[PDB]
Amino acid sequence: INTAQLKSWLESGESADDVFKLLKLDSAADKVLGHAKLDEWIEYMKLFNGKGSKKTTLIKTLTAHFEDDGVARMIQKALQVDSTAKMAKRLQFEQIQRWLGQEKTPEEVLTLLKLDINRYDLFEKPELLTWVKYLDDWNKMYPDRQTTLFARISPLLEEGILANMLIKAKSVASTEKIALRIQAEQTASWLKAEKTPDDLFTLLRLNRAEDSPLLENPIFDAWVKYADDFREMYPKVSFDPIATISEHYTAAQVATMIVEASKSPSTSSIAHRLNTEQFRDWLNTRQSPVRVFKLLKLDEAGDKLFQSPVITTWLNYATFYSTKREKVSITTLLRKRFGDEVLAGILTDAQQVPATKEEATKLLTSLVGRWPKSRVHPDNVYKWLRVEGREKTDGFRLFYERYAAAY
Amino acid sequence: INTAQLKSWLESGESADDVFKLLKLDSAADKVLGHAKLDEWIEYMKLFNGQKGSKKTTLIKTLTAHFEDDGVARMIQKALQVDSTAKMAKRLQFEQIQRWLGQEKTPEEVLTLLKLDINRYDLFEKPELLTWVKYLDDWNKMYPDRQTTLFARISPLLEEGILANMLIKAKSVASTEKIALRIQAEQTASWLKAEKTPDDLFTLLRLNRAEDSPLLENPIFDAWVKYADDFREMYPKVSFDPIATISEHYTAAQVATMIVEASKSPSTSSIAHRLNTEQFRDWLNTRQSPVRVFKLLKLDEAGDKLFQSPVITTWLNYATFYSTKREKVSITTLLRKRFGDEVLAGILTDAQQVPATKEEATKLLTSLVGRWPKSRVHPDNVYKWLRVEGREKTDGFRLFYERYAAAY
């Protein structure tokens, strides 16, 4: 404690603010908290505070030199340093008390913290954390004047833009809680406006596809959950979402988005759900395997049907149909459509493509197995399976051999 | 200190003033308060005054006759800073002020007395100013019915802008900071109370008429933005957007360039980022597409030199900002339709060699070339257009070329 100096200052009539500036403490906000010069100043502020003098606090003086948003940022970082952490926590309290003591509404403090200017960077601003803590203290302090995060933020940000921001705010540790929490209020706000899942779909731009495989969008998984949460409360006047989706995308379009998203853990969960929805809708409305075939336009692929992205969708639905409603042979269908020679060729091709290798084989084993009874000559068994081009060990070649010998 | 001398002067019949002259204390004002012979003069002054029926005098009154009110004020204020002379300076200051207060000279009349009105435009450089500030405060104390402020007495000498400017430089001088801050507060305060709109304060401070000074340089500009903030926060009902004001005097491009040329200096770094946030906000909120902003920034008029405009980084940042908050928009797709694979490949490759553009040029060139296989760009065009020849053996674009020539 430089008594000499403190005395010198008192006897010049330096205010506590004059000394804050003699100390050049307003130079850099990041060299203030937990530094020796502020400790000098604090000792002078005690002495200054008297008795005909104009009292000041440390909060009042910091705010007067760095502004509310400036002070909020100063605390926020100082909370992340151990040296200064206890100081920062007390100083944070005193900031919030000052505002509550005035009665700066959460809306007024939002402006003081310049969060309205910084709207679109909201969740990146340290001052946001100060403000959330102030709103929450405000609501406890004045229960007759309550307000919510979403009520103070949504007038600043377009509904869809706010959604995108929350979704990214969630992948961040410091703002994830807050982002969930505003998400919750935003959902309830939509629910009580009633707001149908189909209105919401287009409110959130989900009917576009320029930049999206859509199932990659957490907005899309956000929707759907709103829709689950819209059966919800209004069980009577509701649909489920495959209805909504289908207003903007076709069967074959939808089936591909699904075939895609199911190849990564990130989206395999929304994909197998949407897949459930599509299968359920086909079966509810009594789509046979044959009927779904056309809905996916696999008849317009001709002989190239095993090269369609949705061929596995169709084979799956057919396996699904037979287990649930009535056994339908895919083999029988493909056989009547192409014939033994063209189908054997088709499937032999599909064996070489890895994503169809196993269902190609499984169908071809089924095809070939009906051939003994259909009186197929071993030359035809040979040429149609393209045995000549197969490996010495290939199961279909060894089938050919035993079929030739038995015959 | 020299009795024979004093005796002699008293015998010679000398006045106090004569002896002031004899000691050559009127020689230079700055020698006096320190001077050896002044204490000599003071003893004589007592002795002279002690004589029956002599016309009395005083130290303040003798200094004033010889150096004028402003010269004595300048003496007292220099001597207030030396340890050796400080306590006499303090006491002289007091008798000066007492004497003025006695004659009931208003702060205004003391202003003219100290020739501060003449020296108006050099105001803060005159030590006499400090003397006058003190006088106004002690006057306020002495005649509480008749108070003024510093701002109220200086304001009529000067245009509002000119005062604002000298206040800034005065703020950065140690002897005038306390005073300059005082007057700033009184200036700001007076504008608020007159509900002077941020838009009207813009022209008054002449921030519109800037051609020879870009704007974010200006400490008055920062001051204006703080005024506009205090104004919103005191009249929340009166809807004010900073960008709206600046852009009736400037173009989107002009404004983005000031921001680019301000971000580099760390001292304007803060006002730069502010104004950038504003600009983006207004674009996003008025739903300006990345292509529309392209036209706004006048990057279409730079043709194939767009990546040499100060403002290209502004556009790309905006483009990325826009894609994150609203709707993803491919910057490659935009530029490829504009230029062609060849012209664009050359634009990017140049931009790849400039520090400020290389990281984005590279991401953009990476996106562009990824599309070349489905467009069947001939491998010799890939090698030419990418300037693969200038590229290091390790370079990813050279490696692209190698893998691509083998598969075609």
PDB file of N, CA, C and O in Angstrom, chain A residues 139-192:
ATOM      1  N   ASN A 139     -36.302 -12.674 -12.859  1.00  0.00           N
ATOM      2  CA  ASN A 139     -37.568 -13.386 -12.730  1.00  0.00           C
ATOM      3  C   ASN A 139     -37.797 -13.861 -11.305  1.00  0.00           C
ATOM      4  O   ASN A 139     -38.939 -13.935 -10.852  1.00  0.00           O
ATOM      5  N   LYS A 140     -36.722 -14.219 -10.605  1.00  0.00           N
ATOM      6  CA  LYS A 140     -36.855 -14.590  -9.200  1.00  0.00           C
ATOM      7  C   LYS A 140     -37.086 -13.355  -8.360  1.00  0.00           C
ATOM      8  O   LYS A 140     -37.891 -13.360  -7.431  1.00  0.00           O
ATOM      9  N   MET A 141     -36.384 -12.288  -8.699  1.00  0.00           N
ATOM     10  CA  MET A 141     -36.485 -11.038  -7.964  1.00  0.00           C
ATOM     11  C   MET A 141     -37.844 -10.358  -8.112  1.00  0.00           C
ATOM     12  O   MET A 141     -38.369  -9.842  -7.140  1.00  0.00           O
ATOM     13  N   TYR A 142     -38.407 -10.362  -9.326  1.00  0.00           N
ATOM     14  CA  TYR A 142     -39.701  -9.725  -9.610  1.00  0.00           C
ATOM     15  C   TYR A 142     -40.650 -10.666 -10.291  1.00  0.00           C
ATOM     16  O   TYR A 142     -40.817 -10.598 -11.514  1.00  0.00           O
ATOM     17  N   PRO A 143     -41.319 -11.519  -9.510  1.00  0.00           N
ATOM     18  CA  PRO A 143     -42.223 -12.539 -10.054  1.00  0.00           C
ATOM     19  C   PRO A 143     -43.470 -11.926 -10.711  1.00  0.00           C
ATOM     20  O   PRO A 143     -44.148 -12.602 -11.482  1.00  0.00           O
ATOM     21  N   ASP A 144     -43.732 -10.649 -10.443  1.00  0.00           N
ATOM     22  CA  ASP A 144     -44.867  -9.965 -11.055  1.00  0.00           C
ATOM     23  C   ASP A 144     -44.469  -9.436 -12.462  1.00  0.00           C
ATOM     24  O   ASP A 144     -45.316  -9.010 -13.256  1.00  0.00           O
ATOM     25  N   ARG A 145     -43.180  -9.482 -12.788  1.00  0.00           N
ATOM     26  CA  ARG A 145     -42.730  -8.963 -14.078  1.00  0.00           C
ATOM     27  C   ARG A 145     -41.883  -9.971 -14.858  1.00  0.00           C
ATOM     28  O   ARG A 145     -40.818  -9.624 -15.375  1.00  0.00           O
ATOM     29  N   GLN A 146     -42.331 -11.215 -14.952  1.00  0.00           N
ATOM     30  CA  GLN A 146     -41.460 -12.205 -15.562  1.00  0.00           C
ATOM     31  C   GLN A 146     -41.475 -12.190 -17.072  1.00  0.00           C
ATOM     32  O   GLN A 146     -42.407 -11.691 -17.705  1.00  0.00           O
ATOM     33  N   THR A 147     -40.403 -12.756 -17.622  1.00  0.00           N
ATOM     34  CA  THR A 147     -40.225 -12.900 -19.044  1.00  0.00           C
ATOM     35  C   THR A 147     -39.305 -14.092 -19.301  1.00  0.00           C
ATOM     36  O   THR A 147     -38.700 -14.617 -18.371  1.00  0.00           O
ATOM     37  N   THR A 148     -39.222 -14.541 -20.545  1.00  0.00           N
ATOM     38  CA  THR A 148     -38.454 -15.746 -20.865  1.00  0.00           C
ATOM     39  C   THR A 148     -37.365 -15.404 -21.857  1.00  0.00           C
ATOM     40  O   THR A 148     -37.445 -14.380 -22.524  1.00  0.00           O
ATOM     41  N   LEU A 149     -36.357 -16.263 -21.960  1.00  0.00           N
ATOM     42  CA  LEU A 149     -35.325 -16.100 -22.979  1.00  0.00           C
ATOM     43  C   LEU A 149     -35.961 -15.908 -24.353  1.00  0.00           C
ATOM     44  O   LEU A 149     -35.663 -14.920 -25.036  1.00  0.00           O
ATOM     45  N   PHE A 150     -36.865 -16.818 -24.732  1.00  0.00           N
ATOM     46  CA  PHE A 150     -37.429 -16.809 -26.073  1.00  0.00           C
ATOM     47  C   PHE A 150     -38.240 -15.532 -26.325  1.00  0.00           C
ATOM     48  O   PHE A 150     -38.204 -14.973 -27.422  1.00  0.00           O
ATOM     49  N   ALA A 151     -38.947 -15.053 -25.310  1.00  0.00           N
ATOM     50  CA  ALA A 151     -39.696 -13.805 -25.456  1.00  0.00           C
ATOM     51  C   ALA A 151     -38.806 -12.599 -25.704  1.00  0.00           C
ATOM     52  O   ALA A 151     -39.239 -11.636 -26.325  1.00  0.00           O
ATOM     53  N   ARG A 152     -37.573 -12.617 -25.210  1.00  0.00           N
ATOM     54  CA  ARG A 152     -36.719 -11.445 -25.394  1.00  0.00           C
ATOM     55  C   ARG A 152     -35.870 -11.572 -26.652  1.00  0.00           C
ATOM     56  O   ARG A 152     -35.506 -10.572 -27.244  1.00  0.00           O
ATOM     57  N   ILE A 153     -35.614 -12.800 -27.091  1.00  0.00           N
ATOM     58  CA  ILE A 153     -34.769 -13.025 -28.259  1.00  0.00           C
ATOM     59  C   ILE A 153     -35.538 -13.124 -29.578  1.00  0.00           C
ATOM     60  O   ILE A 153     -35.122 -12.522 -30.573  1.00  0.00           O
ATOM     61  N   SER A 154     -36.668 -13.831 -29.594  1.00  0.00           N
ATOM     62  CA  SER A 154     -37.432 -14.017 -30.848  1.00  0.00           C
ATOM     63  C   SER A 154     -37.869 -12.706 -31.596  1.00  0.00           C
ATOM     64  O   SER A 154     -37.917 -12.694 -32.821  1.00  0.00           O
ATOM     65  N   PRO A 155     -38.176 -11.602 -30.878  1.00  0.00           N
ATOM     66  CA  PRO A 155     -38.406 -10.352 -31.631  1.00  0.00           C
ATOM     67  C   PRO A 155     -37.178  -9.807 -32.377  1.00  0.00           C
ATOM     68  O   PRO A 155     -37.313  -8.907 -33.198  1.00  0.00           O
ATOM     69  N   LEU A 156     -35.999 -10.340 -32.087  1.00  0.00           N
ATOM     70  CA  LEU A 156     -34.776  -9.873 -32.710  1.00  0.00           C
ATOM     71  C   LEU A 156     -34.374 -10.699 -33.929  1.00  0.00           C
ATOM     72  O   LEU A 156     -33.588 -10.229 -34.762  1.00  0.00           O
ATOM     73  N   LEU A 157     -34.880 -11.932 -34.005  1.00  0.00           N
ATOM     74  CA  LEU A 157     -34.428 -12.899 -35.007  1.00  0.00           C
ATOM     75  C   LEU A 157     -35.566 -13.615 -35.699  1.00  0.00           C
ATOM     76  O   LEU A 157     -36.451 -14.154 -35.030  1.00  0.00           O
ATOM     77  N   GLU A 158     -35.523 -13.650 -37.034  1.00  0.00           N
ATOM     78  CA  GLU A 158     -36.494 -14.399 -37.845  1.00  0.00           C
ATOM     79  C   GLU A 158     -36.551 -15.871 -37.419  1.00  0.00           C
ATOM     80  O   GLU A 158     -35.512 -16.497 -37.202  1.00  0.00           O
ATOM     81  N   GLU A 159     -37.760 -16.410 -37.297  1.00  0.00           N
ATOM     82  CA  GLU A 159     -37.974 -17.764 -36.777  1.00  0.00           C
ATOM     83  C   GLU A 159     -36.999 -18.824 -37.283  1.00  0.00           C
ATOM     84  O   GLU A 159     -36.394 -19.562 -36.489  1.00  0.00           O
ATOM     85  N   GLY A 160     -36.846 -18.891 -38.602  1.00  0.00           N
ATOM     86  CA  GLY A 160     -35.964 -19.864 -39.234  1.00  0.00           C
ATOM     87  C   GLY A 160     -34.495 -19.587 -38.969  1.00  0.00           C
ATOM     88  O   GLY A 160     -33.715 -20.503 -38.722  1.00  0.00           O
ATOM     89  N   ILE A 161     -34.103 -18.320 -39.010  1.00  0.00           N
ATOM     90  CA  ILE A 161     -32.720 -17.992 -38.688  1.00  0.00           C
ATOM     91  C   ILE A 161     -32.393 -18.356 -37.224  1.00  0.00           C
ATOM     92  O   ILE A 161     -31.278 -18.821 -36.932  1.00  0.00           O
ATOM     93  N   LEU A 162     -33.361 -18.168 -36.318  1.00  0.00           N
ATOM     94  CA  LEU A 162     -33.131 -18.436 -34.896  1.00  0.00           C
ATOM     95  C   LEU A 162     -32.990 -19.931 -34.700  1.00  0.00           C
ATOM     96  O   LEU A 162     -32.239 -20.397 -33.839  1.00  0.00           O
ATOM     97  N   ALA A 163     -33.689 -20.696 -35.525  1.00  0.00           N
ATOM     98  CA  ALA A 163     -33.607 -22.145 -35.382  1.00  0.00           C
ATOM     99  C   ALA A 163     -32.199 -22.608 -35.731  1.00  0.00           C
ATOM    100  O   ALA A 163     -31.574 -23.329 -34.953  1.00  0.00           O
ATOM    101  N   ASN A 164     -31.690 -22.160 -36.879  1.00  0.00           N
ATOM    102  CA  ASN A 164     -30.356 -22.541 -37.321  1.00  0.00           C
ATOM    103  C   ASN A 164     -29.305 -22.186 -36.292  1.00  0.00           C
ATOM    104  O   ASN A 164     -28.312 -22.905 -36.121  1.00  0.00           O
ATOM    105  N   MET A 165     -29.517 -21.063 -35.606  1.00  0.00           N
ATOM    106  CA  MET A 165     -28.514 -20.585 -34.673  1.00  0.00           C
ATOM    107  C   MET A 165     -28.467 -21.470 -33.445  1.00  0.00           C
ATOM    108  O   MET A 165     -27.386 -21.848 -33.002  1.00  0.00           O
ATOM    109  N   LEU A 166     -29.643 -21.825 -32.929  1.00  0.00           N
ATOM    110  CA  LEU A 166     -29.772 -22.714 -31.772  1.00  0.00           C
ATOM    111  C   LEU A 166     -29.127 -24.086 -32.005  1.00  0.00           C
ATOM    112  O   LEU A 166     -28.429 -24.619 -31.139  1.00  0.00           O
ATOM    113  N   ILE A 167     -29.355 -24.638 -33.193  1.00  0.00           N
ATOM    114  CA  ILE A 167     -28.815 -25.944 -33.588  1.00  0.00           C
ATOM    115  C   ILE A 167     -27.272 -25.951 -33.528  1.00  0.00           C
ATOM    116  O   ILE A 167     -26.669 -26.946 -33.113  1.00  0.00           O
ATOM    117  N   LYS A 168     -26.640 -24.838 -33.913  1.00  0.00           N
ATOM    118  CA  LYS A 168     -25.177 -24.730 -33.847  1.00  0.00           C
ATOM    119  C   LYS A 168     -24.734 -24.285 -32.456  1.00  0.00           C
ATOM    120  O   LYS A 168     -23.649 -24.638 -31.983  1.00  0.00           O
ATOM    121  N   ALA A 169     -25.588 -23.524 -31.789  1.00  0.00           N
ATOM    122  CA  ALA A 169     -25.322 -23.126 -30.414  1.00  0.00           C
ATOM    123  C   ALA A 169     -25.251 -24.353 -29.519  1.00  0.00           C
ATOM    124  O   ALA A 169     -24.619 -24.324 -28.480  1.00  0.00           O
ATOM    125  N   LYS A 170     -25.916 -25.428 -29.928  1.00  0.00           N
ATOM    126  CA  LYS A 170     -25.927 -26.661 -29.140  1.00  0.00           C
ATOM    127  C   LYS A 170     -24.600 -27.444 -29.179  1.00  0.00           C
ATOM    128  O   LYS A 170     -24.171 -28.021 -28.183  1.00  0.00           O
ATOM    129  N   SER A 171     -23.931 -27.432 -30.321  1.00  0.00           N
ATOM    130  CA  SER A 171     -22.649 -28.116 -30.436  1.00  0.00           C
ATOM    131  C   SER A 171     -21.542 -27.400 -29.663  1.00  0.00           C
ATOM    132  O   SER A 171     -20.385 -27.805 -29.724  1.00  0.00           O
ATOM    133  N   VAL A 172     -21.889 -26.336 -28.941  1.00  0.00           N
ATOM    134  CA  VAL A 172     -20.897 -25.582 -28.182  1.00  0.00           C
ATOM    135  C   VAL A 172     -21.181 -25.748 -26.693  1.00  0.00           C
ATOM    136  O   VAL A 172     -22.315 -25.605 -26.245  1.00  0.00           O
ATOM    137  N   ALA A 173     -20.147 -26.070 -25.927  1.00  0.00           N
ATOM    138  CA  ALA A 173     -20.325 -26.422 -24.520  1.00  0.00           C
ATOM    139  C   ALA A 173     -20.962 -25.298 -23.700  1.00  0.00           C
ATOM    140  O   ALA A 173     -21.930 -25.532 -22.966  1.00  0.00           O
ATOM    141  N   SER A 174     -20.437 -24.081 -23.828  1.00  0.00           N
ATOM    142  CA  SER A 174     -20.886 -22.976 -22.969  1.00  0.00           C
ATOM    143  C   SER A 174     -22.325 -22.525 -23.242  1.00  0.00           C
ATOM    144  O   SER A 174     -22.997 -22.007 -22.359  1.00  0.00           O
ATOM    145  N   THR A 175     -22.798 -22.731 -24.464  1.00  0.00           N
ATOM    146  CA  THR A 175     -24.122 -22.268 -24.814  1.00  0.00           C
ATOM    147  C   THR A 175     -25.107 -23.401 -25.131  1.00  0.00           C
ATOM    148  O   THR A 175     -26.242 -23.135 -25.555  1.00  0.00           O
ATOM    149  N   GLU A 176     -24.701 -24.656 -24.928  1.00  0.00           N
ATOM    150  CA  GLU A 176     -25.590 -25.772 -25.275  1.00  0.00           C
ATOM    151  C   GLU A 176     -26.848 -25.802 -24.384  1.00  0.00           C
ATOM    152  O   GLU A 176     -27.972 -25.959 -24.883  1.00  0.00           O
ATOM    153  N   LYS A 177     -26.661 -25.646 -23.079  1.00  0.00           N
ATOM    154  CA  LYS A 177     -27.782 -25.613 -22.160  1.00  0.00           C
ATOM    155  C   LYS A 177     -28.804 -24.545 -22.552  1.00  0.00           C
ATOM    156  O   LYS A 177     -30.012 -24.809 -22.683  1.00  0.00           O
ATOM    157  N   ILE A 178     -28.292 -23.337 -22.751  1.00  0.00           N
ATOM    158  CA  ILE A 178     -29.099 -22.190 -23.127  1.00  0.00           C
ATOM    159  C   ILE A 178     -29.816 -22.431 -24.461  1.00  0.00           C
ATOM    160  O   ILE A 178     -30.984 -22.055 -24.621  1.00  0.00           O
ATOM    161  N   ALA A 179     -29.131 -23.087 -25.399  1.00  0.00           N
ATOM    162  CA  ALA A 179     -29.704 -23.369 -26.732  1.00  0.00           C
ATOM    163  C   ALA A 179     -30.836 -24.401 -26.676  1.00  0.00           C
ATOM    164  O   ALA A 179     -31.843 -24.249 -27.367  1.00  0.00           O
ATOM    165  N   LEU A 180     -30.672 -25.444 -25.860  1.00  0.00           N
ATOM    166  CA  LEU A 180     -31.762 -26.385 -25.558  1.00  0.00           C
ATOM    167  C   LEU A 180     -32.938 -25.657 -24.926  1.00  0.00           C
ATOM    168  O   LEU A 180     -34.110 -25.883 -25.262  1.00  0.00           O
ATOM    169  N   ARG A 181     -32.599 -24.780 -23.992  1.00  0.00           N
ATOM    170  CA  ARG A 181     -33.587 -24.108 -23.185  1.00  0.00           C
ATOM    171  C   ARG A 181     -34.468 -23.135 -23.983  1.00  0.00           C
ATOM    172  O   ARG A 181     -35.655 -23.016 -23.742  1.00  0.00           O
ATOM    173  N   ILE A 182     -33.876 -22.448 -24.949  1.00  0.00           N
ATOM    174  CA  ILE A 182     -34.627 -21.571 -25.845  1.00  0.00           C
ATOM    175  C   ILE A 182     -35.382 -22.406 -26.910  1.00  0.00           C
ATOM    176  O   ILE A 182     -36.506 -22.087 -27.313  1.00  0.00           O
ATOM    177  N   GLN A 183     -34.744 -23.473 -27.375  1.00  0.00           N
ATOM    178  CA  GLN A 183     -35.413 -24.487 -28.187  1.00  0.00           C
ATOM    179  C   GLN A 183     -36.751 -24.935 -27.569  1.00  0.00           C
ATOM    180  O   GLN A 183     -37.788 -24.988 -28.242  1.00  0.00           O
ATOM    181  N   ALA A 184     -36.722 -25.231 -26.271  1.00  0.00           N
ATOM    182  CA  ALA A 184     -37.904 -25.686 -25.571  1.00  0.00           C
ATOM    183  C   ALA A 184     -39.009 -24.637 -25.597  1.00  0.00           C
ATOM    184  O   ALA A 184     -40.188 -24.940 -25.852  1.00  0.00           O
ATOM    185  N   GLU A 185     -38.626 -23.395 -25.341  1.00  0.00           N
ATOM    186  CA  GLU A 185     -39.598 -22.324 -25.307  1.00  0.00           C
ATOM    187  C   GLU A 185     -40.112 -22.038 -26.707  1.00  0.00           C
ATOM    188  O   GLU A 185     -41.274 -21.667 -26.879  1.00  0.00           O
ATOM    189  N   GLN A 186     -39.266 -22.244 -27.709  1.00  0.00           N
ATOM    190  CA  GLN A 186     -39.669 -21.979 -29.083  1.00  0.00           C
ATOM    191  C   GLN A 186     -40.681 -23.020 -29.547  1.00  0.00           C
ATOM    192  O   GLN A 186     -41.615 -22.696 -30.289  1.00  0.00           O
ATOM    193  N   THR A 187     -40.482 -24.270 -29.117  1.00  0.00           N
ATOM    194  CA  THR A 187     -41.441 -25.350 -29.379  1.00  0.00           C
ATOM    195  C   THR A 187     -42.796 -25.062 -28.734  1.00  0.00           C
ATOM    196  O   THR A 187     -43.844 -25.111 -29.398  1.00  0.00           O
ATOM    197  N   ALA A 188     -42.778 -24.773 -27.432  1.00  0.00           N
ATOM    198  CA  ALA A 188     -44.023 -24.474 -26.735  1.00  0.00           C
ATOM    199  C   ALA A 188     -44.730 -23.271 -27.371  1.00  0.00           C
ATOM    200  O   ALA A 188     -45.957 -23.194 -27.408  1.00  0.00           O
ATOM    201  N   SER A 189     -43.952 -22.339 -27.897  1.00  0.00           N
ATOM    202  CA  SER A 189     -44.532 -21.144 -28.475  1.00  0.00           C
ATOM    203  C   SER A 189     -45.266 -21.480 -29.753  1.00  0.00           C
ATOM    204  O   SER A 189     -46.328 -20.920 -30.049  1.00  0.00           O
ATOM    205  N   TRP A 190     -44.687 -22.391 -30.523  1.00  0.00           N
ATOM    206  CA  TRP A 190     -45.344 -22.883 -31.722  1.00  0.00           C
ATOM    207  C   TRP A 190     -46.568 -23.744 -31.410  1.00  0.00           C
ATOM    208  O   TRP A 190     -47.599 -23.630 -32.070  1.00  0.00           O
ATOM    209  N   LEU A 191     -46.435 -24.606 -30.409  1.00  0.00           N
ATOM    210  CA  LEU A 191     -47.524 -25.471 -29.995  1.00  0.00           C
ATOM    211  C   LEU A 191     -48.749 -24.701 -29.545  1.00  0.00           C
ATOM    212  O   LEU A 191     -49.866 -25.054 -29.922  1.00  0.00           O
ATOM    213  N   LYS A 192     -48.559 -23.652 -28.750  1.00  0.00           N
ATOM    214  CA  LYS A 192     -49.717 -22.918 -28.268  1.00  0.00           C
ATOM    215  C   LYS A 192     -50.306 -21.981 -29.325  1.00  0.00           C
ATOM    216  O   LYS A 192     -51.469 -21.603 -29.224  1.00  0.00           O
TER     217      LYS A 192
END
